[PDB]
Design a protein around this ligand. Structure first.
Ligand SMILES: CCCCCCCCCCCCCCCCCC(=O)OC[C@H](COP(=O)([O-])OCC(O)COP(=O)([O-])OC[C@@H](COC(=O)CCCCCCCCCCCCCCCCC)OC(=O)CCCCCCCCCCCCCCCCC)OC(=O)CCCCCCCCCCCCCCCCC
Ligand SMILES: CCCCCCCCCCCCCCCCCC(=O)OC[C@H](COP(=O)([O-])OCC[N+](C)(C)C)OC(=O)CCCCCCCCCCCCCCCCC
Ligand SMILES: CCCCCCCCCCCCCCCCCC(=O)OC[C@H](COP(=O)([O-])OCC[N+](C)(C)C)OC(=O)CCCCCCCCCCCCCCCCC
Ligand SMILES: CCCCCCCCCCCCCCCCCC(=O)OC[C@H](COP(=O)([O-])OCC[N+](C)(C)C)OC(=O)CCCCCCCCCCCCCCCCC
Ligand SMILES: COC1=C(OC)C(=O)C(C/C=C(\C)CC/C=C(\C)CC/C=C(/C)CC/C=C(/C)CC/C=C(/C)CC/C=C(\C)CC/C=C(\C)CCC=C(C)C)=C(C)C1=O
Ligand SMILES: COC1=C(OC)C(=O)C(C/C=C(\C)CC/C=C(\C)CC/C=C(/C)CC/C=C(\C)CC/C=C(/C)CC/C=C(\C)CC/C=C(\C)CCC=C(C)C)=C(C)C1=O
Ligand code: HEC
Ligand code: HEC
Ligand code: HEM
Ligand code: HEM
Ligand code: HEM
Ligand code: HEM
Ligand code: FES
Lengths: 161, 58, 295, 284, 295, 284
């Protein structure tokens, strides 16, 4: 009991998770457009992808798919797909450029960290893709509900009764 | 032959050390910066204020 | 070991390669009375610098770490400083930590003990008011390329035009002394902007010089205490030079005197055997060798 | 614990006083006095850090303002801070010169073991304390140092289960982290004094200013004959350091390494990663 | 050792002879669920207490130390509490330690993470708005006579009239439970003042009870954590009682077992003398006796 | 220091380990164990108190708010604060019961001197530590305690000069005074452990259960036979104290000496002088 007390004092306790839920209206967004939003005081890029753009983006050599272990989530809500990603250079934290001529993706001026429309690492010293923001679509593409991923924090019972 | 008197002598020598190393540098430093004191600025401001006050309109 | 002088890094300190940083220190020598040998702040210069800071550039910037009362001996007197600073107001929202001492609930005239806050309550308010870019806090601003010169250069380096390939966005201005040569501050110093109390001509170089002197004076290491500490260093160095001979007498001559020894060795051939040498000796670390070594 | 045979010296006040009043030191040169300089710098570091502790409030958001305001309202506080920083610099210089000198003399023999390792351990601890001290500045340099240390600590655990939290809470400098690291810094800084005393007692077993075995048997009495020379050599080296610093570092300078210490944690969020540089001792 | 009750000091604790202290604790027993054996806070009671404190109180009082999110797991949920607390506003002047975190320059809706501040920016503003007397901060208010009963008594005890010789100044009211029985708070609780969300009848005694429960819920040693600690004390006491027999076995019966010895003294008449007794023995502290004692 | 003849027992780690693994204890009763109860409780104060060190920011204007916020957000912080508060009371009770037991036994003989004085000194130091702890609460009780201590200290100098300033800066609880007193409290609290260890080593010379000399030569082994009994007796006394407190201290009480602790310095400038009372241990 005494040791539990000591160690628990050393390791802070997260008694509850602060609300971060948000909703963004995106139904009216024209297809093939990128909109910048602020979530948790951080930039985020939301884009609508048509069927044609998938052929261009996904048809690249497998070797160029740096960090192949990563997964890409496409909402596929409404007529066209909706992708929500975090706008930050994982190498140092700068905001990647929304557009570039070579690819219809995101690139970084700092070190040429090229990211395609799926945020895959391309020709970049970065060790990861653009961070993926937990979200979902429930209004048939009209509205996107976003909330930070909930990790387990224990003990979660503040009162016995 | 009186140890505490010799300790007073050592204290006196340390005092002489301090004053020798202190007085000349302070004197020369405050002689060099005589014209940079606040009193010079105050005198200049007072003179300018007097000149502006004497020559003016209603 | 040898660092190229045209890379843009001074003495090998990489970074700051999109700035003009060697002006006034390495290339050119701007004279500041504070940093000269046996130099000191010019009281009039710092006085005029505070005057210009209060009448302008105090509407965007501030020294949260500093307070006015630093100017009580070399730049102002208590009554004069109080009267000058009573022209500004501080809401309780300005305070960084009220701590129950600040009981005001409305704007009140500043006192010399108040920290130098900007007119804005917070950094975000200033950033919003100035086109989304925050006027940097001048406390601890000593840590900039060129040191004291950094304030002087930026305030004055609005004359050059951008080269080809560099675009200055609307609301931004070209200034080679700032990071990446784009700065969000419109030029503020204009001839005749501030009427000095001593009648000194108010030309933009003079105002920049006075501002730089004041800002430097408000620092802690390279500020109002550096000259006296340098004089103290000189005095201590003189004391060490004077004490070196006595150290020599105490230590080296004394050791040489102690080594003036006469040695003599004779031939002892009496019957006594050197049994003490054969059976003798003590080692303080014998406990570390017993049962471990040479068995 | 039968494996542990005992201790070379019993560090009791009576026996320590007797040992230091009867100690003898063989004639030596300045090269074999870096240890005394290191110990004296440690003592001054203890004193100056104790003086500083009464001024530093361990809350991150008050340390910069507290330091700035207490340099003016209180006399000698900034003097003690400067003394502490320069003492750290000179302590590193003396320690590394001592290490090089002892490597030069080939002191890796068995009879030097107790002398050598006891020293290195001290040096090792002397590293940790310095790290903690950096964290107390609450600048961007402190932020980067803490982040690097936390990543290194988390390396051993493969980034699993936040084993670093008990010290590097969130890998960021906050009230809890600053308080814990400041207290640990103070305690380990004072422990360094005892470690240095143990090392100094151990090393006297076989002490030599030069590798060549001089046949001299007479030796200096430590209290004043050797202590005065040690203090004088410290004075000479300090004069040389003052001259070198005065001429190599002009009063105003451009592009110093302290320019990365402008950013204060909390006040400034953005970090100028282009110019990231620690103090010269952690530069390697 | 024996004390007197007619004096007006409970159990011999002087200093509270100018007010009623034994109303509901010593001379009366007002039932509170929290302090009952195996008792716990009534969630409805604390909910109603917060509802009352947010509609009548709070506009004068506050808890600088406490914050709303204390009510997350017992009285209100996160969304409900956020909805309730969004009706209030905090200016940046409220913050005890504004810090760099709070970057607002105007009023904004409160959040559950905000500390419970009164509408006034400081104590002096409250005194100015309340006739020169400061509405006491309810944080740490547990340290008043009667504990949780205090809030209940003052909220209710306004019906009595002053005796002869006591003058109630204009703007003051007679309340026997307050220090010197003169309080600057007008009677706040009136039947029907607050319409509860749960439909509970709104009468001054019920409102006082709910407010007292809520105010006690925010305390540290007493309040939301006391009942669990009481249960823990019960559990630890049970553990000690259950461990006592094993301690007995391991210590006292064991010593009695070890003392079961047989002794036998024989006649040894061999020629050997008892030299060891005559010449023998040692003392640890002999160094403290040698040269000092018995000579 | 030739006047000093040495120390009773060398406190080397190996020697301490051997001494305590070979120590024997004569058969005893509960009354002759309060000393152990005085030590074990201290062994908790160093722990619990340490957990409070990481929580308390020495700024007077933040100590109450910090404590209140750490009670909720952090877990076990209020538990450790309660443990520390009640440990002070239990330590006073145990120490005074031990003092009374040793006075009753006529332990003033010469062979008891080392045992007696070495103990009393610790007790004296303990008092000082307790005083410092009170000042850290930043309540009106702390204000009164500091004022009284400063007045007593100044009485030595006849009210001339400001010799009290180096610790009692302005005779008020401010940042300087709180920081210095808190750090001294920690340092002296940890020094109490060493003083108690020295006292325990010294007292074994002539330790007896009762005045009458039982002719028993066999003895228990301390590590488990005596240690288990001491721990069990501590458990029994804790049970007795809890039972007593249950009846004597109902949580809702009409009046208590703790009400004077309501006022927090700085927040409330009005001190209720009519009801001024310290904790029971400093009551006399
Ligand atoms: C609430 C209030 C509470 C109370 C507060 C007040 C507390 C008072 C404490 C009193 C302590 C008494 C100590 C007695 C010994 C002192 C030395 C001695 O014998 O004196 C005779 C000596 C006679 O003169 P002398 O013939 O020329 O001989 C000079 C030699 O010292 C002669 O030495 P030597 O060459 O013959 O041999 C020296 C040494 C041979 O050399 C050694 O072995 C040296 C020691 C080695 C081990 C330690 C290494 C570190 C060195 C010592 C520490 C120095 C720094 C201390 C820093 C303190 C913090 C700042 O041999 C010994 O003497 C062996 C014993 C050494 C002393 C230790 C044992 C006795 C004292 C302690 C006993 C108890 C144990 C300690 C813990 C007690 C806790 C309660 O007197 C003096 O010379 C005194 C001069 C004083 C004036 C000059 C300095 C002034 C300071 C200037 C700085 C600015 C401040 C100004 C002052 C402000 C007001 C204070
Ligand atoms: C009077 C007896 C003295 C000691 C007897 C020794 C023999 C013990 C025999 C076995 C006992 C077994 C039952 C132990 C039950 C403990 C409570 C429990 O289970 O809670 C676990 C809980 C965890 O419960 P949980 O995991 O179910 O989560 C609930 C969390 N709370 C309570 C917040 C709602 O852990 C603790 O609380 C650990 C102790 C607190 C932290 C350290 C400080 C301790 C301070 C003293 C507390 C005890 C007061 C009385 C004694 C004082 C010291 C002498
Ligand atoms: C910056 C780093 C490098 C430089 C550092 C600068 C030096 C700092 C420390 C200097 C200490 C003073 C010099 C000591 C040298 C050794 C002297 C010696 O052996 O003694 C014999 C000498 C004199 O002996 P003598 O034999 O040469 O001559 C006297 C003999 N008769 C009388 C017969 C002629 O002692 C002194 O003169 C002074 C001794 C002072 C006591 C020694 C320890 C001092 C430590 C400093 C702090 C003291 C505080 C005292 C107050 C209490 C405060 C709590
Ligand atoms: C605790 C602070 C200690 C500060 C130490 C700083 C050094 C001060 C002295 C500097 C040099 C000046 C010397 C002047 C001449 C002195 C001659 C003399 O008297 O000789 C003494 C003699 C000298 O030692 P000696 O007899 O071995 O000398 C032999 C001869 N020589 C030195 C030449 C080799 O020794 C003593 O009697 C030492 C007494 C020390 C007393 C220390 C008391 C400290 C009390 C602190 C507070 C205690 C609180 C307790 C808890 C309370 C709880 C409520
Ligand atoms: C002479 O008379 C006397 C007496 O008799 C009356 C006394 O009673 C007394 C009183 C005695 C005392 C207060 C002493 C009693 C002390 C008490 C109860 C508190 C301290 C008790 C202890 C057991 C301290 C133990 C300290 C520790 C650091 C060890 C922690 C304990 C345990 C079980 C863990 C041990 C294991 C580890 C450290 C290793 C764990 C980790 C690994 C194996 C992984 C390693 C690998 C990787 C990769 C990390 C005295 C002084 C006396 O003088
Ligand atoms: C893993 O986590 C951990 C840590 O963090 C990571 C740790 O730091 C630690 C260790 C650290 C701690 C427990 C915290 C300890 C902190 C320390 C030691 C820092 C402080 C260090 C110091 C050197 C402080 C020195 C202070 C001073 C000199 C202040 C002097 C002040 C005073 C009042 C001195 C004068 C007074 C006295 C001596 C008291 C005597 C009595 C009187 C004067 C009576 C007066 C009254 C009257 C009536 C006469 C551990 C164990 C840990 O586990
Ligand atoms: C409001 C109109 C301002 C006035 C009046 C002054 N300055 Fe300013 N300054 C202002 C802004 C919005 C900025 C940010 C520019 C950017 O691109 O970030 C600045 C910046 C500076 C700097 C550089 C700070 C840095 O961290 O590099 C300096 C040295 C500076 N300003 C100086 C300065 C001087 C000397 C002024 C007259 C005394 C002055 N400023 C007035 C906005 C405003
Ligand atoms: C403004 C009209 C107020 C309202 C609404 C409430 N209270 Fe109040 N209270 C107010 C003042 C000006 C004072 C100070 C009176 C004095 O003489 O100092 C108080 C005081 C109290 C107290 C006693 C404080 C003390 O330190 O003893 C209590 C217990 C109290 N108030 C309770 C209380 C409750 C429960 C309220 C909601 C029903 C409430 N107050 C509202 C001003 C105002
Ligand atoms: C050998 C002993 C010590 C070493 C090597 C050491 C090292 C350091 C270092 C490297 C720093 C940062 C300096 C900088 O970044 O410029 C520092 C700061 C600091 N140290 Fe130590 N230290 C020692 C002893 C102590 C002690 C004993 C204390 C307190 C009792 C202490 C208190 C502090 C404080 C308060 C700071 C920060 C001061 C400020 O930020 O204003 N130090 N130390
Ligand atoms: C803070 C760190 C250290 C302190 C305070 C310290 C202190 C000292 C002192 C005072 C001496 C005697 C004077 C001298 O020999 O010059 C000494 C000697 C010695 N030191 Fe250290 N030292 C430190 C670090 C080290 C390191 C890093 C090493 C080796 C890696 C080391 C190994 C030795 C050895 C072997 C000697 C004896 C030399 C010989 O026998 O000739 N020490 N030390
Ligand atoms: C923090 C305060 C103290 C601590 C931690 C402490 C601790 C101890 C311990 C663990 C023992 C051995 C177990 C036992 O008591 O039977 C002991 C014995 C003893 N202590 Fe203490 N004690 C303290 C205060 C005192 C005081 C105030 C006195 C005398 C006024 C004192 C004098 C003695 C004596 C005389 C003995 C037994 C020696 C004999 O019988 O001859 N101690 N103490
Ligand atoms: C025998 C050892 C100790 C004793 C007798 C002691 C005594 C006390 C006392 C009397 C108080 C205030 C009592 C009250 O609040 O009613 C206190 C509080 C405190 N103690 Fe200790 N203490 C000891 C050890 C320690 C240690 C070693 C530390 C830190 C390393 C520490 C840290 C604290 C802190 C921070 C507080 C105030 C906590 C707060 O106000 O929230 N204590 N102690
Ligand atoms: S900073 Fe954006 S890629 Fe290196």
């Amino acid at each position: 009991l005494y040791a539990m007390g000591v160690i628990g004092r050393l390791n802070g306790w997260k008694r509850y998770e602060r609300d971060t839920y948000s909703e963004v209206d995106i139904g009216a967004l024209p297809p093939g457009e990128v909109m910048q939003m602020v979530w948790n005081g951080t930039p985020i890029f939301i884009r609508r992808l048509t069927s044609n753009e998938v052929k261009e983006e996904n048809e690249l050599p497998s070797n160029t798919l740096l960090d192949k272990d990563k997964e890409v989530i496409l909402s596929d809500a409404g007529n066209t797909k909706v992708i929500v990603v975090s706008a930050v250079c994982t190498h140092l934290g700068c905001i990647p450029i929304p557009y570039l001529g070579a690819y219809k993706g995101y690139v970084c001026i700092c070190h040429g960290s090229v990211y395609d429309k799926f945020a895959r690492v391309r020709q970049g010293p970065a060790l990861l893709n653009l961070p993926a923001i937990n979200n979902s679509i429930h209004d048939e593409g009209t509205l996107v509900c976003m909330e930070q991923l909930k990790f387990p924090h224990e003990p979660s019972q503040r009162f016995w009764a | 032959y009186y140890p505490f008197l010799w300790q007073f002598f050592i204290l006196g020598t340390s005092f002489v050390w301090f004053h020798v190393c202190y007085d000349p540098w302070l004197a020369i430093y405050q002689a060099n910066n005589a014209h940079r004191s606040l009193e010079t600025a105050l005198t200049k401001e007072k003179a300018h204020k007097k000149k502006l006050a004497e020559q003016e309109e209603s | 070991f040898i660092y190229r002088d045209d890379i843009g890094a001074f003495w090998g300190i990489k970074g700051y390669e999109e700035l003009v940083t060697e002006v006034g220190t390495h290339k050119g020598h701007n004279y500041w009375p504070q940093f000269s040998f046996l130099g000191t702040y010019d009281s009039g210069s710092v006085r005029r610098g505070f005057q210009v800071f209060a009448r302008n550039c105090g509407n965007c910037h501030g020294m949260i770490y500093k307070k006015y009362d630093y100017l009580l001996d070399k730049a102002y007197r208590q009554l004069e400083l109080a009267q000058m600073v009573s022209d500004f107001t501080i809401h309780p929202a300005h305070q960084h930590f009220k701590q129950y001492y600040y009981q005001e609930w409305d704007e009140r005239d500043r006192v010399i003990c108040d920290h130098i806050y900007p007119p804005y309550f917070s950094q975000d308010q200033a950033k919003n008011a100035n086109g989304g870019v925050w006027p940097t806090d001048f406390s601890k601003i000593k840590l900039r390329p060129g040191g004291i010169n950094y304030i002087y250069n930026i305030s004055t380096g609005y004359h050059f035009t951008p080269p080809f390939g560099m675009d200055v966005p609307k609301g931004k201005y070209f200034n080679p002394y700032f990071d990446h040569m784009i700065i969000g501050m419109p030029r503020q110093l204009v001839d005749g902007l501030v009427d000095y109390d001593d009648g000194t001509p108010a030309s933009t170089p003079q105002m920049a010089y006075d501002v730089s002197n004041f800002i430097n004076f408000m620092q802690r290491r390279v500020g109002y205490k550096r000259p006296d500490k340098m004089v103290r260093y000189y005095m201590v160095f003189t004391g060490g030079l004077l004490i070196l001979p006595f150290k020599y007498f105490k230590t080296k001559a004394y050791y040489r005197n102690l080594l003036s020894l006469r040695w003599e060795m004779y031939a002892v051939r009496d019957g006594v055997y050197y049994n003490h040498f054969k059976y003798g000796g003590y080692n303080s670390r014998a406990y570390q060798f017993r049962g471990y070594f040479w068995a | 614990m039968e494996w542990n045979k005992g201790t070379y010296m019993s560090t009791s006040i009576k026996k320590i006083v007797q040992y230091f009043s009867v100690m003898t030191v063989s004639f030596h040169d300045i090269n074999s006095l870096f240890g005394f300089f290191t110990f004296l710098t440690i003592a001054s570091q203890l004193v100056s850090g104790t003086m500083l502790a009464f001024s530093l409030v361990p809350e991150p958001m008050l340390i910069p303002m507290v330091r700035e305001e207490e340099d003016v309202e209180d006399l000698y506080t900034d003097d003690f801070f400067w003394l502490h920083e320069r003492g750290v610099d000179m302590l590193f210089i003396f320690s590394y010169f001592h290490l090089f000198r002892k490597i030069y003399l080939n002191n890796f023999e068995y009879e030097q073991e107790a002398a050598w390792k006891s020293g290195v351990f001290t040096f090792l601890l002397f590293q940790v304390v310095v790290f903690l001290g950096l964290v107390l500045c609450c600048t961007h340099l402190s932020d980067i140092t803490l982040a690097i240390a936390a990543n290194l600590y988390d390396t051993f655990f493969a980034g699993k289960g936040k084993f670093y939290w008990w010290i590097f809470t969130s890998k960021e400098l906050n009230t809890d982290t600053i308080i814990r690291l400041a207290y640990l810094h103070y305690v380990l800084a004072f422990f360094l004094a005892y470690l240095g005393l143990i090392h100094g007692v151990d090393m006297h077993y076989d002490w030599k200013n030069e590798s060549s075995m001089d046949g001299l048997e007479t030796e200096m009495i430590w209290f004043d004959e050797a202590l005065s020379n040690e203090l004088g050599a410290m004075i000479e080296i300090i004069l040389i350091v003052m001259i070198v610093c005065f001429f190599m570092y002009p009063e105003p300078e451009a592009l110093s390494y302290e320019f990365f210490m402008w950013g204060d944690i909390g006040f400034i969020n953005d970090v100028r990663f282009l110019s990231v540089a620690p103090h010269w001792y952690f530069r390697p």
